[PDB]
Amino acid sequence: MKYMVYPQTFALNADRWYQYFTKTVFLSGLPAALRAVACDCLLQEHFYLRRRRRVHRYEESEVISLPFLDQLVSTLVGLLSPHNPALAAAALDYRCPVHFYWVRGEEIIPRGHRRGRIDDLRYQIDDKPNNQIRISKQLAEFVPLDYSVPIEIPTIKCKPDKLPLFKRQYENHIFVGSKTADPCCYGHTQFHLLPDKLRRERLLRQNCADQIEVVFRANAIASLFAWTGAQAMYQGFWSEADVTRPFVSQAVITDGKYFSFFCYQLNTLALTTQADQNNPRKNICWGTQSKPLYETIEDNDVKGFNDDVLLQIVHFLLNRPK
Amino acid sequence: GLEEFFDDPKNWGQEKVKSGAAWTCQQLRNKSNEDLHKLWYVLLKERNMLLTLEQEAKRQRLPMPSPERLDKVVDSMDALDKVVQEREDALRLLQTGQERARPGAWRRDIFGRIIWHKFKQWVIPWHLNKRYNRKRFFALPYVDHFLRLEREKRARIKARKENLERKKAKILLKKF
Amino acid sequence: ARNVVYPLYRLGGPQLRVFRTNFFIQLVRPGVAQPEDTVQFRIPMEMTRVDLRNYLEGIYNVPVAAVRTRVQHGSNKRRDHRNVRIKKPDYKVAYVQLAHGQTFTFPDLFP
Amino acid sequence: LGQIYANNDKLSKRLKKVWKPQLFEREFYSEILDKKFTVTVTMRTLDLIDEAYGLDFYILKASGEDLCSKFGMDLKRGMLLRLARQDPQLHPEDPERRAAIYDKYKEFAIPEEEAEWVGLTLEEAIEKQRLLEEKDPVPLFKIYVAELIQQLQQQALS
Amino acid sequence: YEWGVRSTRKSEPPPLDRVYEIPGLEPITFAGKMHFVPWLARPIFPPWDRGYKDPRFYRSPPLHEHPLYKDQACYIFHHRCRLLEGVKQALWLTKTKLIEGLPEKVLSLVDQDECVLNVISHARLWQTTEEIPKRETYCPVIVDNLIQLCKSQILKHPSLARRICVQNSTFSATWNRESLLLQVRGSGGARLSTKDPLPTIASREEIEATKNHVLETFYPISPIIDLHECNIYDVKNDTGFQEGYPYPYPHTLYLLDKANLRPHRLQPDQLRAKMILFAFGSALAQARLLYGNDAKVLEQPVVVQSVGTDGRVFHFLVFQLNTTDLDGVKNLAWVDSDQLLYQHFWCLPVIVEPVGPVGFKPETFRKFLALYLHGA
Amino acid sequence: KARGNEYQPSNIKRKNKHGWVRRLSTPAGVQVILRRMLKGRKSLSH
Amino acid sequence: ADRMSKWTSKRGPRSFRGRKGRGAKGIGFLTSGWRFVQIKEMVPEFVVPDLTGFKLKPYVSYLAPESEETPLTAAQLFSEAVAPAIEKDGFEPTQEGKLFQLYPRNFLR
Amino acid sequence: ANFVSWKSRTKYTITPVKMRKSGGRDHTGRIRVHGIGGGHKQRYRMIDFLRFRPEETKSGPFEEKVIQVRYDPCRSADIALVAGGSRKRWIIATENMQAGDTILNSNHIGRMAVAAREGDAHPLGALPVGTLINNVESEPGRGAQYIRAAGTCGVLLRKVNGTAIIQLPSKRQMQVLETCVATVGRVSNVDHNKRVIGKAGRNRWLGKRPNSGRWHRKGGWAGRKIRPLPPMKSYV
RNA sequence: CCUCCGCAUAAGCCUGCGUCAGAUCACACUGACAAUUAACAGCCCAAUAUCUACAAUCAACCAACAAGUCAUUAUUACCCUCACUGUCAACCCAACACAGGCAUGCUCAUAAGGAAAGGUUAAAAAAAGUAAAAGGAACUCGGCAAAUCUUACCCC
RNA sequence: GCUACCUAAGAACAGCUAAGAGCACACCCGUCUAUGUAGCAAAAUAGUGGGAAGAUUUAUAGGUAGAGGCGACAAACCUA
RNA sequence: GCUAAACCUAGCCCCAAACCCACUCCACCUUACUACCAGCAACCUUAGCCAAACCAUUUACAUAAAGUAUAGGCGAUA
Numbered sequence A: 001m002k003y004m005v006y007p008q009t010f011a012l013n014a015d016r017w018y019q020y021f022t023k024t025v026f027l028s029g030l031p032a033a034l035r036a037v038a039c040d041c042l043l044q045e046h047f048y049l050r051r052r053r054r055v056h057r058y059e060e061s062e063v064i065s066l067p068f069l070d071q072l073v074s075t076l077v078g079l080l081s082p083h084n085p086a087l088a089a090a091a092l093d094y095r096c097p098v099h100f101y102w103v104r105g106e107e108i109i110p111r112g113h114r115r116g117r118i119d120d121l122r123y124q125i126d127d128k129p130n131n132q133i134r135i136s137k138q139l140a141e142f143v144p145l146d147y148s149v150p151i152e153i154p155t156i157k158c159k160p161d162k163l164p165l166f167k168r169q170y171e172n173h174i175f176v177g178s179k180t181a182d183p184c185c186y187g188h189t190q191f192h193l194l195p196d197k198l199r200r201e202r203l204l205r206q207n208c209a210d211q212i213e214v215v216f217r218a219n220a221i222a223s224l225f226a227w228t229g230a231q232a233m234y235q236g237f238w239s240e241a242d243v244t245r246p247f248v249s250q251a252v253i254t255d256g257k258y259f260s261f262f263c264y265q266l267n268t269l270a271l272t273t274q275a276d277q278n279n280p281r282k283n284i285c286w287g288t289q290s291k292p293l294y295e296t297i298e299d300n301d302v303k304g305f306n307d308d309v310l311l312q313i314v315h316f317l318l319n320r321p322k
Numbered sequence B: 001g002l003e004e005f006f007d008d009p010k011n012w013g014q015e016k017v018k019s020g021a022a023w024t025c026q027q028l029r030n031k032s033n034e035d036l037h038k039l040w041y042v043l044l045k046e047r048n049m050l051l052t053l054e055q056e057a058k059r060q061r062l063p064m065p066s067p068e069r070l071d072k073v074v075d076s077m078d079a080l081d082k083v084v085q086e087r088e089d090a091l092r093l094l095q096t097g098q099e100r101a102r103p104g105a106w107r108r109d110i111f112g113r114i115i116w117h118k119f120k121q122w123v124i125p126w127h128l129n130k131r132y133n134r135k136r137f138f139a140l141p142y143v144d145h146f147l148r149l150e151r152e153k154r155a156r157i158k159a160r161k162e163n164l165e166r167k168k169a170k171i172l173l174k175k176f
Numbered sequence C: 001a002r003n004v005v006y007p008l009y010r011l012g013g014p015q016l017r018v019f020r021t022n023f024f025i026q027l028v029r030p031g032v033a034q035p036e037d038t039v040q041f042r043i044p045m046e047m048t049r050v051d052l053r054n055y056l057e058g059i060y061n062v063p064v065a066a067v068r069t070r071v072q073h074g075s076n077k078r079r080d081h082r083n084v085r086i087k088k089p090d091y092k093v094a095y096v097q098l099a100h101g102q103t104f105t106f107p108d109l110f111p
Numbered sequence D: 001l002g003q004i005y006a007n008n009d010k011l012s013k014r015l016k017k018v019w020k021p022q023l024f025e026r027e028f029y030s031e032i033l034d035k036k037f038t039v040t041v042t043m044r045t046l047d048l049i050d051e052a053y054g055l056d057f058y059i060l061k062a063s064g065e066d067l068c069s070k071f072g073m074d075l076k077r078g079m080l081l082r083l084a085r086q087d088p089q090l091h092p093e094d095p096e097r098r099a100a101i102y103d104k105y106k107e108f109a110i111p112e113e114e115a116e117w118v119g120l121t122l123e124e125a126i127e128k129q130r131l132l133e134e135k136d137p138v139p140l141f142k143i144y145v146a147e148l149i150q151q152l153q154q155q156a157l158s
Numbered sequence E: 001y002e003w004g005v006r007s008t009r010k011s012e013p014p015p016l017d018r019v020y021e022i023p024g025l026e027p028i029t030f031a032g033k034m035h036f037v038p039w040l041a042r043p044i045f046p047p048w049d050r051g052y053k054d055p056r057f058y059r060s061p062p063l064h065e066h067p068l069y070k071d072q073a074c075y076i077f078h079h080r081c082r083l084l085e086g087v088k089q090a091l092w093l094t095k096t097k098l099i100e101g102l103p104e105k106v107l108s109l110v111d112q113d114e115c116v117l118n119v120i121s122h123a124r125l126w127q128t129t130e131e132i133p134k135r136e137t138y139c140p141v142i143v144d145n146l147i148q149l150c151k152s153q154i155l156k157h158p159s160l161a162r163r164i165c166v167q168n169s170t171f172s173a174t175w176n177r178e179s180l181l182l183q184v185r186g187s188g189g190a191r192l193s194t195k196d197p198l199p200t201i202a203s204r205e206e207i208e209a210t211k212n213h214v215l216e217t218f219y220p221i222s223p224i225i226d227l228h229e230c231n232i233y234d235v236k237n238d239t240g241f242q243e244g245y246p247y248p249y250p251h252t253l254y255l256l257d258k259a260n261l262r263p264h265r266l267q268p269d270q271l272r273a274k275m276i277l278f279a280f281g282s283a284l285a286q287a288r289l290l291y292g293n294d295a296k297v298l299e300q301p302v303v304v305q306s307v308g309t310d311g312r313v314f315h316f317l318v319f320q321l322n323t324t325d326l327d328g329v330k331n332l333a334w335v336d337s338d339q340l341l342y343q344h345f346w347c348l349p350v351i352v353e354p355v356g357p358v359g360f361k362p363e364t365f366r367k368f369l370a371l372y373l374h375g376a
Numbered sequence F: 001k002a003r004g005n006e007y008q009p010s011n012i013k014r015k016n017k018h019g020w021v022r023r024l025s026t027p028a029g030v031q032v033i034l035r036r037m038l039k040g041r042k043s044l045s046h
Numbered sequence G: 001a002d003r004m005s006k007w008t009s010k011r012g013p014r015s016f017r018g019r020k021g022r023g024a025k026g027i028g029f030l031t032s033g034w035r036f037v038q039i040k041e042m043v044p045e046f047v048v049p050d051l052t053g054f055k056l057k058p059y060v061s062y063l064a065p066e067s068e069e070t071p072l073t074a075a076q077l078f079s080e081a082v083a084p085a086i087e088k089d090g091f092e093p094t095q096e097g098k099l100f101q102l103y104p105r106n107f108l109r
Numbered sequence H: 001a002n003f004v005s006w007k008s009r010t011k012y013t014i015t016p017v018k019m020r021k022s023g024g025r026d027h028t029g030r031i032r033v034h035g036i037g038g039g040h041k042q043r044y045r046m047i048d049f050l051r052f053r054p055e056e057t058k059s060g061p062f063e064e065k066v067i068q069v070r071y072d073p074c075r076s077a078d079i080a081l082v083a084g085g086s087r088k089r090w091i092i093a094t095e096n097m098q099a100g101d102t103i104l105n106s107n108h109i110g111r112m113a114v115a116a117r118e119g120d121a122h123p124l125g126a127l128p129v130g131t132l133i134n135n136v137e138s139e140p141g142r143g144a145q146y147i148r149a150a151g152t153c154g155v156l157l158r159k160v161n162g163t164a165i166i167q168l169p170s171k172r173q174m175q176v177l178e179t180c181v182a183t184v185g186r187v188s189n190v191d192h193n194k195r196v197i198g199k200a201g202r203n204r205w206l207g208k209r210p211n212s213g214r215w216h217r218k219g220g221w222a223g224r225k226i227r228p229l230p231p232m233k234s235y236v
Numbered sequence I: 001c002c003u004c005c006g007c008a009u010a011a012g013c014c015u016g017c018g019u020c021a022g023a024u025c026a027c028a029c030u031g032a033c034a035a036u037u038a039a040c041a042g043c044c045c046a047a048u049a050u051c052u053a054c055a056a057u058c059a060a061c062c063a064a065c066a067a068g069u070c071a072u073u074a075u076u077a078c079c080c081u082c083a084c085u086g087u088c089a090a091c092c093c094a095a096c097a098c099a100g101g102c103a104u105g106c107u108c109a110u111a112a113g114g115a116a117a118g119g120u121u122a123a124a125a126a127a128a129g130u131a132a133a134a135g136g137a138a139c140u141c142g143g144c145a146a147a148u149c150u151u152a153c154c155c156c
Numbered sequence J: 001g002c003u004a005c006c007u008a009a010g011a012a013c014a015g016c017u018a019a020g021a022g023c024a025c026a027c028c029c030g031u032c033u034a035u036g037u038a039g040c041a042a043a044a045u046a047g048u049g050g051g052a053a054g055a056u057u058u059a060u061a062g063g064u065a066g067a068g069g070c071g072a073c074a075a076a077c078c079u080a
Numbered sequence K: 001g002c003u004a005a006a007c008c009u010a011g012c013c014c015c016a017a018a019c020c021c022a023c024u025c026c027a028c029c030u031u032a033c034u035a036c037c038a039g040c041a042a043c044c045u046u047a048g049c050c051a052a053a054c055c056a057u058u059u060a061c062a063u064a065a066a067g068u069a070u071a072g073g074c075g076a077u078a
């Protein structure tokens, strides 16, 4: 029986608990013709394409925004394939799930016929990103391994059931987006879209206005550790044969307008308390704030546009394996 | 904030809190419907204060600090919920003339007895209802024997009860 | 409110407005070392989750952010001298999570 | 419903038997209700219509325990209303046949406050009684102001 | 014979009571009460209307009372309309001559074989945690990963950058035939769109050579046998984009075939016929938009191509519309049939004949790659 | 075989067979409830 | 096989447990994907006043006198519907155009 | 007793409808016929037996195209999906009706009889004397009721005033009008009679429970009854 | 030292070895207090028309018969949003803390889960085994049982 | 709710050899034996055995009822 | 001398007399104890044990006339 960790969470302060389950310290910051193609795949879905169905408010994240990203990425992979030859030889998958199963800590079983026996308490992240990019070779390092970052990983003082995080027993998959006999094992950029339970508006109608940024960061700390950590397991490394080099990938989160950019680097897999008593390795997640890619649309024109949000996409789609 | 679930912390663990004279229903009659509405939300703020304390008295195995003021407040709302219900049932007789704010009718059930079948507020007429037309409010005269048998079972218990008290009164008159 | 009848709303009726709320809650100490920011009540059985959210922000002005509910079964195996069962009354339990990091912990009554 | 002896003989087997009457579907014209009824009539009613000289004389004459029917007593209620309300039954432009028909069946025609209550079963006369005195309650405003306007009637003469 | 067995039919109403047959007395029903009673005969309720409007309990007006009731019955060809008489029924509706190979303008464009196989076996083996992924999840992935093989050739050619694929696009196009008001409707597949239109393939010498042969007639089959026989239909025709949209010109329709049950699959001889009317519908939707409504011969003939389905077998098509006068000059279509990349797959080894796609053929990707670079 | 375990319980099958709707459905079954309210049972059905 | 137990939601199979529920007085409805639609209009919002400057407290003091009851009959309150009804020498005919109808009781508590 | 028939469809269609088995039970729930129940699960293909059924806004004779000659589970005679005009329907295939043929449905009774081929369907007076017919009607417009089983055919014996005389496969005679339609040729799936079930369990695939084990003594009914062949049955 | 079990789900039961206290083979019984939080699972669908010949089997060749488990469109109507309920356990059906009965998914030797011996002596009889000289069915209704593996033929 | 049959929509069947095929697990049945006989058990245990891709097994809901149901007849089974 | 013994009084029976009973609030024919959406509806001779020493017709369900007239395998019995 394992805890089922959902990256796209509705829980409050779920960034802090997800840091403890993953041993990731969080750092703010980071380690002209494109505006034609990006605003042509923006106004296509929201204005230009004609739909025979009336679009309700609940369908807008499923029919407008989710076809906006795979139009936006599929060009920007094709446009920067001259600027970056690694994207031509890449593989681009759409909505193909990522799985990671790890185990972190112990617990004495509180009651049952197994009372008092120590039980390692497991986790699984089963996430489906919007679309992801996989390279046959691995990215650069972003920081040395055994980096200091003295910013004190949190610890929770109670049971992980208390954030509304439940248990099931089901299949334990560890899964980068493809199977094991696939030479594009590494991956470098992941794209996410939040669903309509976690909009900007719905988290403001309820008084958790502070958890706007957290659901951006909970989705990133979880899914990247799910992605990078599974990338390590495909290269033989596991909880006791810990990683030599650090595995790394970067992700961008989207809710329609607002884009958050994240770089993540897995430094360790030795998360079990048998292998966590002489271990100073900490994973690091770097994070931006969410910034609007546009203000609004007056039915044919994106009104207040920021192209720096387009710069931070095209930076992530530029950096090349060494 | 949450602190008004709790009393003043100068009264914590004092085993005696001086709070008496529950709201007698005459004194609430003098106040307006504005102020009775504001009074309800003050007794609510203080009944919720007391129910935390007695649930915490039971948790830490201690007696309540002063149980005698819990029933002061619950009958004060009951008097408040009585006085307001007088004024509606006053002027529902003036504007309509008809009691029972819920409409109902005397309907005989399957089992032959009559009940006060209250009404249940639907969006369709009663002749189109799938469920209400599956319900049956009538006799079907096989019941008429079982009505008589219960009519005698009620009468026999009543006849027993009337006859104890005459035997009990006689043994009192055989002694005094 | 409870032990009352609700007016039935078709499509464009008024907002259902409640004066003189019938149901009374109580705030408890959690028994299992609840998190900070999580504060636990005892909802009476006829009260909705959003019916508690609006009840705290309405009266007690608490900026509540996330609410969870669960129903606790009262134990029935309590026998008498008549050998008939006595059911301790089953109740509803809130888990209110406060907004803005308001950070409430349960105080020590009976010092 | 009854029993018979086997060969009209009572020290043989006693064995049950039901005797059904013979049923016909015969058209029937009425000169009061002016319709062509379709009735599941038997032979005896045909020979009781014939001795009474017409259907309209049969229902109005034969007594309460002799029709042994509810469709019959609903006709008796239907026909006696036509004899007591003095209905323009036929159509307009024809008042001379209508007065003739009412003159043939004139040895009848009780007042209409009786004729509403013929042919009603007990559990159907309850529902007729319940509806007429139904009487949704008057508000007590109009009672109490009519007791105060009357109180000024004992003021203005004082 | 009439279908609809009497017991399963909605019942007769019960015979009305005889009080209602007697003129004129007022019946005593249970309607004064509010419940059924076995005595007190049943009332006749007046018909009930719901005064307001309810979207969750709406009732439609009857068919003749919809405001668009056109007795010239339309015959819509939508995405689910499976033909009877195959490609030959499609040629007659679209006034086309079939040519039995890809044109020589596009095969000459091709005058890097491991990278094909890593697109096949990624869709058939490596895609999901399940072994043997089903056809509803390798039918789109095999054509959205062969496209990324030919979006890799942006290094050679710059004009591929003025091309996107569109997933939610529909269209509609109407035309009379003899004189049947026909109609196609919108896509359920990828529509590669270009800022520029396509080069025409047949010269006017080869266009006017298509006055001679007669269209095939497939008596006794009606030509509209299994299109949606259709009243209320709203005759207007339209490509599913607003005006002023950049990338207006469709290059290729990438029609798909999911639905892993073989009865639900589109039976390849029938599937050539489907994508003709989707190619013709997109072509005619432009000629109704760039030009007027005039049933004429086109001055500049519009060309739409289309690639097939069904991740094993592929069906290539280019198609030049050159007449919007239906009812001498005829359109002409080049089709290449049953191309069939990778004879069979083995997802897990058989016992010896190892795991991998057996019967690979590189040439069908070469024909695939030709139709992609037709614009550049 | 062994012969005691002849009540394999379920709650769908219990209330479809001995429920209050099933008792009031048939006029014979209505008499069952009347013989139980006459005796004064605590549970007139399931 | 237990008859005298109360039939609560915790007892049946999966189809049975999800249906019954406790005395909720539910809000919305279910549409086509098991997608719940919470109606804002059917949610009871509270009419809570403000309490600052308010003279009354949950208890009274004992020095307040004892007084005898007066169940406010409809007769009594008509005698204060008299202050315009003596000058002629307040009523509503129906409640169809009223928002707080008395006999078909439109409101709550 | 909750038994509604599965036979509930008001429009004709091509697609196989979900058949419910019965096991021989009634609408009540008791058994009526024994040895029925529990075969392979099947689906019904709705057969149009009225062979000349004119389409909407269509009057006279027309033609069809045999698309596929399938195998029918629900009956002994394998059928054909055939299409003419703007519609499709199933008909019972006659023998040597392969896919891609043409059948015709005449309506006029000619001055001369037709050279009737192996599959076509003409009204009965327009057929010769000695022709081998099937799917006949006991009234014009009734639909086919008699000869329908696989391999069977009726022979048109002789034609009297306003009638025709048919010999049914039990060699019994029959008196019907010459107006009523009947198809030509034998019913397909011939040599069905000479199939061998092979094993006891193949009967259970067809839905045939085994015969009961009670030994019944054979009564007087069981002698070989050489009886004279029954008279002419008149439907006119 | 055993593991013929185990862990979930479904069904079922409905608080039934959590804390504090207590009365009174050995110290799950009694009283008070506590918990099981939805995202998985339940609880679903606006009409009236109109469509659905081509099994599944790695679905490709091939080969079938017993003929098969999954599909919309047209127009009208529509823009409120994440409520309710299940969630504990050593457990259920067998009167029992019963060697019995009990569907599925993973684990196929176990990272779960467990204890055949209250202590002693080492009689008979009985049971469950193991070993046996020489002989090898002589036993017996019968090679039953056990141990070894095999020959031929009847009856039905 | 057991069982007899049926209906609806489900599930299970390793390995090896080559089809109401063979060996053989899970699973189903219960041949012969010994124990047990107020027992572990109001029919079980231990071995031994029959079948184990089908006339197989099995979960779920439904149907048929006593002058009757049902039954591959044993006068079987229909809450010991 | 342990086990235990004892106890009156709950209540009840039988009659007389008098005709009995139904809305605190909410919930209850759907799987009763469930706030909320578009088709059916009740009336049908009791039989049998038993007695006839079997059983087959048959066998009871104020006083007085009177166990009379009658009925009945003219018999048990009515």
Ligand SMILES: [Mg+2]
Pocket: H211
């Ligand atoms: Mg036979």
Ligand SMILES: [Mg+2]
Pocket: H212, H213, H214, H215
């Ligand atoms: Mg036999």
Ligand SMILES: [Mg+2]
Pocket: none
């Ligand atoms: Mg659990």
Ligand SMILES: [Mg+2]
Pocket: F004, I094
């Ligand atoms: Mg037992």
Ligand SMILES: [Mg+2]
Pocket: I113
């Ligand atoms: Mg262990």
Ligand SMILES: [Mg+2]
Pocket: none
């Ligand atoms: Mg011992």
Ligand SMILES: [Mg+2]
Pocket: I132
């Ligand atoms: Mg020896």
Ligand SMILES: [Mg+2]
Pocket: none
């Ligand atoms: Mg011897």
Ligand SMILES: [Mg+2]
Pocket: none
């Ligand atoms: Mg011997």
Ligand SMILES: [Mg+2]
Pocket: none
């Ligand atoms: Mg042996």
Ligand SMILES: [Mg+2]
Pocket: J021
């Ligand atoms: Mg076999």
Ligand SMILES: [Mg+2]
Pocket: none
């Ligand atoms: Mg075998």
Ligand SMILES: [Mg+2]
Pocket: none
């Ligand atoms: Mg059997």
Ligand SMILES: [Mg+2]
Pocket: J073
């Ligand atoms: Mg026998």
Ligand SMILES: [Mg+2]
Pocket: none
């Ligand atoms: Mg015998």
Ligand SMILES: [Mg+2]
Pocket: K051, K052
């Ligand atoms: Mg006798």
